[PDB]
């Protein structure tokens, strides 16, 4: 009966197999090249590569964050004693006067003799946190009669093109700095030789990962989300000034405390897990927003003075922004240190594979090289059209920055893009192995990806990077045609 019911079935019900060639692969996401779409704006929580840390060399005392912000502002007394705003940029539905009065309220609250960092419910506080903006709930009969109460359409995420700052965030957070920021606790003493091998590998891996900019940004996110959840549960019906802070150790072993700005937690009666608390963030920076003007249409940028980091003199700007978060992003921000692990294992496995080819532990031969082994170099990125090979620790830092930006810009679009582009990565790998892959509906496979590219900066930059790398693979594949023919 199966062969009977396969002869009265139409020939239009088929699987339509198609042999996949290299020229069959088009670039994913074409609308990101269209110049009639706006550049994708910066929509992270805190500043990452444009951060400015006011240092204060403390004397071994984790006393209080309010006292820490007070002492670090007492060291920079000129930025604290600014009472005149110099407006550089303004957001669209913003209010520069209320944001400046709230910054002055945060400065006058953090530098008093008191022991509490609470704000009052002024006009500017109730505007910037957002009070009474909930809709009133009425009964269903009155709304059934009311012909004005429609059901509002959802706002689809806007479509955006490749903004050139995401490459800058990748290039700068994957570089070495002079300060550490990781608070790694001690471990038990080593007895087995596995633990000696692990410690002598961990010294190399940590000394590459710890002294980099993404580790400082990661610890800033972790500590701010921890303090934010603490103040959200302890203080729900109060506006609280929370300083953005970090602890840093330079190459000399000297410990500094870096202040990165302040923040105003709104009213945080977070009953559900997707309920929003409004956080008004005031962050220091030294980047002029007039340079890249489309990067910041969400920020209000003042100027509060100058800073002599050396004999050179730089300017200092104050990025003000109304923002929000919920309980789940705070929990996953308290657990961001796992961005080490997903980046460490993926490199350490490679070391272990090399250790099973040569016969000895190849950590030093991979990272720095030794007598009978050249160091491991990985193809790391582009430079004016060509391909550049970088170091092992460079690739370790690039994978760490990738996992950190998976956390930072993570929403449903990054998940959908990741799955539907992994399904295409396996096809390109089957094309590189000379297995001869066959597809059945390639245009729908591409269309499942291209509906996830809306406004996420990491997704748009990842589609741009996919098209770049695919062009390099198509260029590289043109040597196999001379094999046995």
């Amino acid at each position: 009966a199966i062969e009977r019911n396969l002869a009265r079935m139409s020939p239009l019900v088929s699987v339509t197999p198609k042999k996949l060639t290299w020229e069959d692969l088009r670039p994913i996401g074409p609308h990101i090249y269209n110049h009639e779409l706006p550049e994708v704006p910066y929509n992270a929580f805190l500043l990452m590569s444009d951060e400015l840390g006011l240092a204060n060399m403390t004397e071994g005392k984790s006393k209080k964050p309010k006292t820490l912000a007070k002492e670090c502002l007492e060291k920079y007394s000129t930025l604290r004693d600014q009472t005149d705003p110099i407006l550089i940029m303004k957001s669209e539905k913003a209010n520069e006067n209320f944001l400046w009065k709230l910054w002055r309220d945060c400065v006058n609250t953090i530098s008093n003799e008191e022991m509490s960092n609470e704000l009052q419910k002024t006009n500017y506080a109730k505007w910037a946190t957002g009070d009474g903006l909930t809709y009133q709930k009425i009964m269903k009969e009155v709304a059934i009669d009311d012909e004005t109460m429609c059901q509002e359409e959802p706002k689809i995420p806007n479509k955006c093109r490749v903004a050139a700052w995401v490459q800058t965030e990748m290039n700068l957070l994957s570089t070495l700095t002079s300060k550490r920021a990781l608070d790694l606790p001690e471990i038990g003493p080593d007895v087995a030789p596995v633990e000696h091998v692990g410690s002598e590998r961990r010294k190399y891996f940590v000394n590459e990962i710890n002294y980099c900019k993404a580790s400082t940004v990661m610890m800033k996110y972790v500590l701010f989300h921890t303090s934010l959840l603490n103040e959200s549960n302890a203080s729900m019906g109060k506006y609280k000034v929370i300083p953005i802070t970090n602890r840093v150790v330079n190459e000399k072993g000297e410990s500094f405390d870096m202040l990165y700005g302040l923040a105003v937690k709104g009213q945080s009666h977070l009953r559900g897990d997707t309920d929003v608390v409004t956080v008004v963030t005031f962050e220091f920076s030294s980047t002029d927003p007039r340079v890249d003007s489309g990067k910041w249409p969400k920020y209000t940028v003042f100027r509060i003075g100058s800073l002599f980091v050396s004999g050179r003199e730089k300017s200092v700007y104050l990025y003000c922004r109304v923002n929000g978060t919920n309980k789940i992003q705070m929990k996953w921000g308290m657990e961001a240190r796992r961005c080490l692990l997903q980046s460490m294992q993926q490199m350490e496995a490679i070391v272990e594979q090399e250790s099973s080819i040569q016969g000895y532990d190849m950590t030093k031969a991979c990272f720095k090289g030794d007598r009978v082994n050249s160091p491991k170099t990985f193809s790391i990125g582009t430079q004016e059209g060509k391909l550049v090979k970088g170091s092992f620790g460079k690739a370790l830092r690039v994978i760490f920055t990738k996992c950190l930006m998976h956390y930072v810009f993570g929403n449903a679009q990054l998940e959908g893009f990741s799955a539907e582009s992994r399904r295409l990565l396996l096809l390109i790998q089957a094309l590189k192995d000379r297995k001869g892959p066959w597809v059945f509906d390639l245009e729908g496979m591409y269309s499942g990806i291209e509906e996830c590219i809306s406004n996420n900066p990491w997704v748009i930059q990842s589609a741009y990077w996919f098209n770049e790398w695919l062009g390099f693979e198509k260029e590289g594949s043109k040597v196999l045609e001379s094999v046995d023919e």
Binding site: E153, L184, R201, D273, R338, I380, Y407, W469
Partner: protein, 735 residues
């Protein structure tokens, strides 16, 4: 100007080796905000869209608009198709019964032997059950208990016979009742003064009353599913709807899933119910056997596939025929019992969630339009997509807020029987005696096909024939998510085979956090997770030591238990610094008491108090390991309480579930009454928490006989005086 490309790691590394970078599981999973009426209505519409060419009719039991796609016309295009031909299903089961002789009768004998011993407490092993007496979601034991105490009013006492079979007999004897009577819960909506925008507060105090429903409303409630949306689903862009069956359904689904589990255990070409390294060894053995089975000089292709619309195109009218053909030798009562469940799944009525919310923007108002009152407003007061969906829902929308859902398998409680159907599609292996042969692997809706032939055009003919065959059984292979390469690298249920399965570290990465039960159990859980990922997930020694450090840092920042020599301040760090300065042997302090970490790789399976037992001060060990510490609730008869052995870091956190503006007086008192009765029963019978007590008699009679015998043995052995014995028997005579 060097510009970093993170995909260029894939130039030196293959994709399957570096697949852990393609899983963004350090980010936040997507959750659902708001209603779940839109995805439920779209599920109903898309289910009836692939089945609308079949026989539409009206059931004369309920009144719903039933749709029968089975034995319908054949498909004409590559759209999803639900018209499964019956003769092709029975012929595939003929092939699968020829190839494994005696399998069906052995599975039916084992399932019938398992059913004759199973009690009703098996129906307390569920997460959240749709309760029909409140039309809500209750837990499974609460839904079962309300059903039993409600069936006692309608003279259905078959739950006091102990077993499962008289309870299911009571279930199908409830459907032929003229009127049902049960226990409902209503509330008092008390008005209270307050100070906010609206002015007053609405306090909902619930209390339990007695209700009476008619016959057809009971048949509609007992066949109803409760629909919601699934949260934390990684790997998808848009959300989806899921459903929940009542207590009158799971009691029959258990037997059919047990039957299909007995069949699936003995099929070589499945992926259920194996799991873990067992499944990895089985799949590696199967891939090696299908790799050595290639002809000399041929080509073996591998299709990495996925089926689109698995719950939306399968049919319970095919599962009824599968339980009729599998149980072809069992007695007639077992065939009726095994045919009840796909009958109830072919008359299911989906409840449509919470409704839609309509807002007035200029007045700052909003309101919630429920599911019965859904069509009470004009369709111009909706969006575009909601207007289109409400226009498509109107033939099937019943006037009580539910909707008929005859085709499809929305609740999805047949993960093993659909695997049997997929293997029966895999067990055909040829069509028309052409020059190929296929063989595959099938978990519930994920397959992997292997086609050996002479050259790859013949392999493509075999793949086209497998697609056409799967169309005949209701299995639409997704042409967008499937691809086909040569043998050696494929993917099956997110297991990436590249000449052996590779190690994916990033999938089991969200388990590495502090699990959150108490301090001691979280330390044990975290070190065991690091140890097991070191065993079978490729986490090396350096990564595991770094994971020990990161777990200790997150543990200290969660439980506020930093090291006593550090300078961190808090409500706990005051006494932690005091304990650090008091203790002589500070290396024996636990990490929850502000101590040093001594965990490493070689001691991950030893707990925290055992590792630090010979480094402890005796005063700190006596204060920690106190048998009467008030943080661990002992087993006392409600002193003479038992000694709680574990430390003070095994405290309990009572999750005081109290809703806003809900005075939970009476729902606390009934739960307290049940807890008091069970506490006295466990006082009388001590092994009630180790072994399940059997017995078809009353708990008062069992306790009375146990106390009478206990007093009689305590009297004659001198432990009880004659006046105490007279008090005991004079009390027991008045009971």
């Amino acid at each position: 100007g060097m510009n970093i490309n993170p995909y260029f790691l894939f130039i030196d590394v293959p994709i399957q080796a570096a697949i852990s970078t393609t899983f963004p599981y350090t980010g936040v999973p997507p959750y659902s905000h708001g209603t779940g009426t839109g995805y439920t209505i779209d599920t109903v519409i898309r289910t009836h869209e692939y089945s609308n060419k079949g026989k539409q009719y009206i059931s004369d039991v309920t009144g719903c608009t039933m749709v029968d796609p089975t034995n319908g016309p054949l498909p004409e295009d590559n759209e999803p198709s639900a018209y499964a031909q019956l003769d092709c299903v029975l012929e595939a089961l003929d092939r699968m019964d020829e190839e494994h002789p005696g399998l069906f009768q052995a599975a039916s004998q084992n399932a019938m032997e398992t059913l004759m011993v199973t009690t009703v407490d098996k129906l307390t092993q569920g997460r959240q059950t749709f309760d029909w007496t409140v039309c809500r979601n209750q837990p499974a034991a609460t839904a079962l208990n309300t059903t039993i105490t409600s069936f006692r009013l309608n003279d259905l006492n078959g739950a006091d016979k102990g077993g499962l079979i008289p309870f299911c007999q009571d279930i199908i004897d409830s459907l032929d009742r003229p009127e049902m009577t049960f226990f409902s819960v209503k509330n008092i909506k008390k008005k209270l003064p307050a100070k906010n925008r609206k002015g007053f507060l609405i306090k909902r105090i619930p209390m339990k009353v007695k209700d009476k429903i008619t016959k057809v409303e009971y048949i509609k409630r007992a066949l109803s599913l409760n629909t919601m949306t699934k949260d934390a689903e990684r790997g998808k862009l848009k959300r989806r709807a899921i459903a929940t069956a009542g207590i009158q359904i799971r009691g029959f689904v258990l037997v059919v899933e047990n039957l299909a589990k007995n069949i699936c255990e003995n099929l070589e070409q499945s992926g259920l119910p194996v799991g873990g390294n067992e499944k990895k060894a089985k799949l590696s053995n199967a891939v090696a056997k299908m790799l050595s089975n290639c002809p000399p000089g041929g080509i073996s292709m591998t299709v990495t596939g996925d089926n689109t619309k698995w719950n939306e195109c399968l049919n319970p009218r095919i599962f009824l025929a599968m339980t009729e053909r599998i149980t072809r030798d069992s007695p007639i009562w077992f065939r009726d019992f095994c045919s009840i469940a796909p009958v109830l799944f072919s008359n299911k009525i989906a409840r449509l969630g919470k409704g839609f919310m309509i807002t007035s923007k200029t007045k700052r108002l909003k309101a919630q339009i429920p599911c019965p009152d859904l069509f009470s407003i004009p369709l111009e007061r909706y969006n575009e997509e909601t207007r289109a969906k409400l226009k498509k829902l109107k033939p099937f929308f019943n006037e009580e807020g539910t909707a008929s859902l005859s085709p499809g398998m929305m609740m999805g409680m047949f993960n093993m029987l659909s695997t049997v159907l997929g293997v029966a599609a895999l067990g055909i292996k040829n069509i028309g005696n052409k020059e190929y042969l296929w063989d595959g692997l099938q978990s519930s809706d994920d397959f992997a096909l292997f086609v050996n032939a002479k050259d790859e055009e013949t392999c493509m003919e075999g793949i086209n024939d497998f697609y056409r065959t799967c169309k005949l059984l209701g299995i639409n292979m997704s042409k967008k998510k499937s691809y086909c390469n040569e043998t050696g690298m494929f993917e099956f249920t997110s297991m990436f085979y590249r000449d052996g399965f590779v190690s994916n570290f990033a999938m089991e990465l969200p388990s590495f956090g502090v699990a959150g039960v108490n301090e001691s159990a979280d330390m044990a859980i975290g070190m065991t997770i690091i140890k097991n990922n070191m065993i079978n997930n490729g986490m090396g020694p350096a990564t595991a030591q770094t994971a020990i450090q990161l777990f200790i840092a997150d543990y200290r920042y969660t439980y506020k238990c930093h090291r006593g020599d550090s300078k961190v301040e808090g409500k706990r760090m005051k006494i932690i610094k005091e304990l650090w300065e008091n203790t002589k042997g500070r290396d024996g302090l636990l990490v929850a008491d502000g101590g040093p970490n001594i965990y490493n790789l070689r001691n991950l399976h030893i707990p925290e108090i055992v590792l630090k037992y010979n480094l402890m001060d005796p005063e700190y060990k006596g204060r920690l390991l106190h048998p009467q510490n008030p943080f661990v609730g002992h087993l006392s008869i409600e002193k003479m309480d038992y000694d709680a052995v574990s430390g003070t870091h095994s405290w309990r956190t009572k999750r005081n579930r109290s809703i806003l503006n809900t005075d939970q007086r009476n729902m606390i008192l009934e739960e307290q009454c049940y807890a008091k009765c069970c506490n006295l029963f466990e006082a009388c019978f001590n092994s009630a928490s180790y072994r399940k007590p059997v017995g078809q008699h009353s708990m008062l009679e069992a306790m009375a006989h146990r106390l009478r015998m206990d007093a009689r043995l305590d009297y004659e052995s001198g432990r009880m005086s004659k006046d105490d014995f007279e008090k005991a028997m004079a009390h027991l005579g008045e009971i």
